[PDB]
Amino acid sequence: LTERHKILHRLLQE
Amino acid sequence: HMTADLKSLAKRIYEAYLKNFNMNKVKARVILSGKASNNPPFVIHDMETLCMAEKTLVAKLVANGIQNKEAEVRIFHCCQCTSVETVTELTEFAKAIPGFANLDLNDQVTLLKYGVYEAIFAMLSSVMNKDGMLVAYGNGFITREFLKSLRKPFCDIMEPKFDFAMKFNALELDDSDISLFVAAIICCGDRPGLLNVGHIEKMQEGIVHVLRLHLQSNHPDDIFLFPKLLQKMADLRQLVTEHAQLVQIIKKTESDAALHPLLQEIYRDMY
Ligand SMILES: CC(C)(Oc1ccc(Cl)cc1)C(=O)O
Ligand SMILES: CC(C)(Oc1ccc(Cl)cc1)C(=O)O
Numbered sequence: 601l602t603e604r605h606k607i608l609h610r611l612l613q614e
Numbered sequence: 615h616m617t618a619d620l621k622s623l624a625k626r627i628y629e630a631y632l633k634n635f636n637m638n639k640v641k642a643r644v645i646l647s648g649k650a651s652n653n654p655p656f657v658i659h660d661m662e663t664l665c666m667a668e669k670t671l672v673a674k675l676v677a678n679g680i681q682n683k684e685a686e687v688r689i690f691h692c693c694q695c696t697s698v699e700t701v702t703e704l705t706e707f708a709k710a711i712p713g714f715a716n717l718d719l720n721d722q723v724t725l726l727k728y729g730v731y732e733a734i735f736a737m738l739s740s741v742m743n744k745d746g747m748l749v750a751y752g753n754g755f756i757t758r759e760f761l762k763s764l765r766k767p768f769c770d771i772m773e774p775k776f777d778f779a780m781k782f783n784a785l786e787l788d789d790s791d792i793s794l795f796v797a798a799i800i801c802c803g804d805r806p807g808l809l810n811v812g813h814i815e816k817m818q819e820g821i822v823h824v825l826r827l828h829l830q831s832n833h834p835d836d837i838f839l840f841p842k843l844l845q846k847m848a849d850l851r852q853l854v855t856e857h858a859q860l861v862q863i864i865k866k867t868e869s870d871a872a873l874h875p876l877l878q879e880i881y882r883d884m885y
Contacts, residue, residue, distance in 0.1 A: 601720045601723055601724065601807065602719060602720060602723060604879065604882065604883070605723045605727065605879045605880075606879065607875060607876045607879060608701075608705070608723050608726060608727065608876070608879060608880070609719065609723060611702060611705045611706075612705060612709065612719060612722050612723065612726075613719075
């Protein structure tokens with residue numbers, strides 16, 4: 601589900 | 615009654631909200647009432663004023679391949695950029711909610727995927743009145759009637775948001791209410807595909823509990839304000855479901871209306 605939401609995933613980790 | 619740990623949860627949610635959202639209700643109402651300044655926002659009410667406003671945005675429009683698209687496509691390219699910014703702010707806001715960052719990363723994505731546009735349309739009410747909405751960080755005001763005047767289907771995008779906003783604004787919420795409301799929207803145990811539903815439901819219960827006690831104290835005469843907001847949460851899920859359907863229709867029948875990549879992954883496989 602994180603492969604399908606790369607940008608969201610990046611902002612969340614940031 | 616409201617114990618110390620509950621007051622603290624409400625305070626850090628309110629502070630996270632004031633830190634992360636450039637535009638909020640107190641600032642928007644000052645602009646819309648025009649009681650702090652005789653220099654009102656530039657009004658976009660027809661094609662000519664749109665094109666005047668776009669002379670200012672030229673370098674940004676030419677940044678993408680947008681300056682020569684149809685007006686409908688240019689308008690909602692700028693609305694998308696606003697959405698992207700708000701999603702970015704909402705992501706920071708969520709990570710400041712106690713317990714959100716502890717969740718599995720998959721669950722953080724799911725909560726934001728399904729939550730952000732419910733939060734977006736709730737907070738959009740702050741910058742709307744019956745005649746239009748503030749744009750460009752409060753410097754512009756685009757009229758409701760101009761948006762209704764666009765061609766199908768672009769004229770159908772915003773009017774249901776105005777409809778929600780007029781009823782939502784009649785509740786007279788302030789920023790302290792809205793921050794808790796938005797936090798309740800994000801920490802929703804219902805979302806499709808959530809893994810640790812028990813633990814998220816727990817988290818939501820505490821926030822919704824603080825919301826209820828805060829509302830009873832902040833709006834004591836509006837006895838059923840909490841039930842009204844529960845209903846507004848249901849209305850937002852339906853508002854967003856229909857918005858997603860319209861976005862899908864536009865994405866299939868409109869060759870020139872590209873979706874920003876961040877919004878693309880939000881909408882993909884949504885409803
Ligand atoms: C509110 C907004 C801008 O609505 C639209 C409308 C048209 C398209 Cl193509 C994409 C999105 C959004 O979802 O961010
Ligand atoms: C004024 C309008 C309708 O929308 C926006 C939205 C956000 C920004 Cl930052 C700039 C413009 C436009 O220029 O087409």
